[PDB]
Each structure stands twice: as structure tokens, then as C-alpha cells.
Design a binder for this molecule. Structure first.
Ligand SMILES: *C(=O)CSCCNC(=O)CCNC(=O)[C@H](O)C(C)(C)COP(=O)(O)OP(=O)(O)OC[C@H]1O[C@@H](n2cnc3c(N)ncnc32)[C@H](O)[C@@H]1OP(=O)(O)O
Lengths: 4, 190
């Protein structure tokens, strides 16, 4: 999951 | 369960998956940017009743050429931006199926590896990726803007995990001791  | 390309009409159907605490809800334009640029790599898993029970978003790229002399430069590779499977549908091979399809695309594209960021507290995902041949390459300090368990922590580290693809014949892009190598978020580029 990439950071927001 | 049937796997198929994401389409924009699916945007209102991701809610159940995105209730998961390790699944980010990105902005609309973000999903749509992956759809525009890498539509073959944005795949959804749907059950017999039409519900979306998982999805994966990926991309192919290298670091911008201006960084070609950095030790943190990334060559041509595939990146897993997000993967998620609804909690009622786990341990049925959906995650692996979505990942294997992205790996097949990376292999056909001569990617050097597939990589991803994972919260260091996300032990389920870490165990999942390790079982498929991914290993920690480095720790990105403070990569995540909040912590998954401790609200007093202002951030959480990421493991940058990698699975080698067949182009990496010398395995020069993976490490045995990756948890010991720390970088700052400033060396992650867009
Ligand atoms: C950014 O997106 C990259 S890091 C964040 C990953 N996403 C995430 O954390 C969201 C919530 N979690 C999930 O959606 C889900 O738990 C996955 C996506 C991590 C895994 O999905 P599946 O449950 O569909 O995985 P499978 O393909 O069924 O599993 C294959 C093999 O992986 C190992 N595995 C999976 N979950 C495990 C746990 N909890 N503990 C240990 N090992 C695990 C197993 O070897 C499994 O094979 P089995 O035959 O044992 O099922």
C-alpha cells in the first residue's frame, strides 16, 4: 500500500 | 470468483474492501490515473453476486533519469501500489492470483523486480509476500503519515519489499539483510  | 480489469463504474463498489484497516482509500483522481496509464494492471476480483471482493493496482516504471547516479535509483521495475482482499474471502488464493498476474506482466516487460511498500506492523501482508518470494530490501523511515496501532506515534516505517524477476540473473537488486538498511522518505520519488 502506497502512502496517501 | 472472476478476475477482470477495473472500470470506472467500479468506483462505488470498493467500499467493503476499503473498510480494511491496512487498505488506504485514495482520492478518486488517483484510481482514475492508474486506470488511464496502466489499465491492464488495475484488476478486480468479483464474486458470483457481482460484489468486488479484491483488487490490485500496479505500474511499470523506473526512477526519473535525473537520479540515475543516486545509489537509491530504481531501474525498470513493476510496483504494487495497492492490493486488498475482503476479509471474508481471504486464504482462498485471491491475493496470490492477483499478484501472480501482475508478476506475469512484469516478467513479459523485462522488469528487474516487483516491489511494494508495507507497514512494518502489517504482519499478515509481510507473511503473504514472504511466502511468494518477496524479501525486505530496505526500511523507509516515516514513510506512512500515521501509525496503524499507536496514535501517539506520528508516523510508521515501511518495508520496501522486492521479488526478483528473471532479468536479475546476478540478484543484484535484492539483499539478505534488508531490515538493516534504512533510508529517508526523501529518496522515494514520483
Ligand atoms: C500495499 O498494498 C502492499 S502491503 C499491503 C497489503 N494489503 C493489505 O494488507 C490489505 C489487507 N489484507 C489482505 O487483503 C490480505 O490479507 C492479503 C492481500 C495480504 C492476502 O490475501 P489472500 O488472503 O487472498 O492471500 P492468499 O493468496 O489466499 O494467500 C497465499 C499465501 O500467503 C500466505 N498468507 C496469506 N495470508 C497470511 C497470513 N495472515 N498469515 C500467514 N501467511 C499468510 C500463506 O502462505 C497463503 O497460503 P495458504 O495455502 O496458507 O492459504
Amino acid at each position: 500500500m502506497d502512502e496517501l | 470468483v472472476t478476475v477482470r480489469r477495473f472500470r470506472p463504474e467500479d468506483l462505488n463498489k470498493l467500499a467493503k474492501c476499503n473498510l480494511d484497516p491496512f487498505t488506504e482509500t485514495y482520492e478518486l483522481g488517483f484510481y482514475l490515473q492508474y486506470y488511464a496509464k496502466w489499465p491492464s494492471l488495475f484488476q478486480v476480483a468479483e464474486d458470483q453476486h457481482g460484489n468486488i471482493i479484491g483488487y490490485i493496482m500496479g505500474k511499470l516504471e523506473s526512477s526519473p533519469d535525473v537520479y540515475r547516479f543516486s545509489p537509491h535509483y530504481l531501474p525498470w521495475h513493476a510496483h504494487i501500489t495497492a492490493v486488498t482482499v475482503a476479509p471474508e474471502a481471504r486464504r482462498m488464493g485471491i491475493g496470490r492470483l492477483l499478484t501472480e498476474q501482475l508478476e506475469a506482466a512484469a516478467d513479459a516487460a523485462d522488469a528487474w523486480f516487483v516491489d511494494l511498500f508495507v507497514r512494518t506492523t502489517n504482519h499478515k501482508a509481510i507473511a503473504f509476500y514472504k511466502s511468494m518470494g518477496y524479501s525486505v530490501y530496505r526500511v523507509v523511515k516515516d514513510y506512512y503519515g500515521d501509525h496503524s496501532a499507536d496514535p501517539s506515534r506520528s508516523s510508521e516505517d515501511a518495508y520496501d519489499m522486492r521479488k526478483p524477476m528473471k532479468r536479475d540473473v546476478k540478484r543484484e537488486h535484492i539483499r539478505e539483510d534488508g531490515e538493516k538498511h534504512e533510508v529517508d522518505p526523501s529518496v522515494v520519488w514520483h
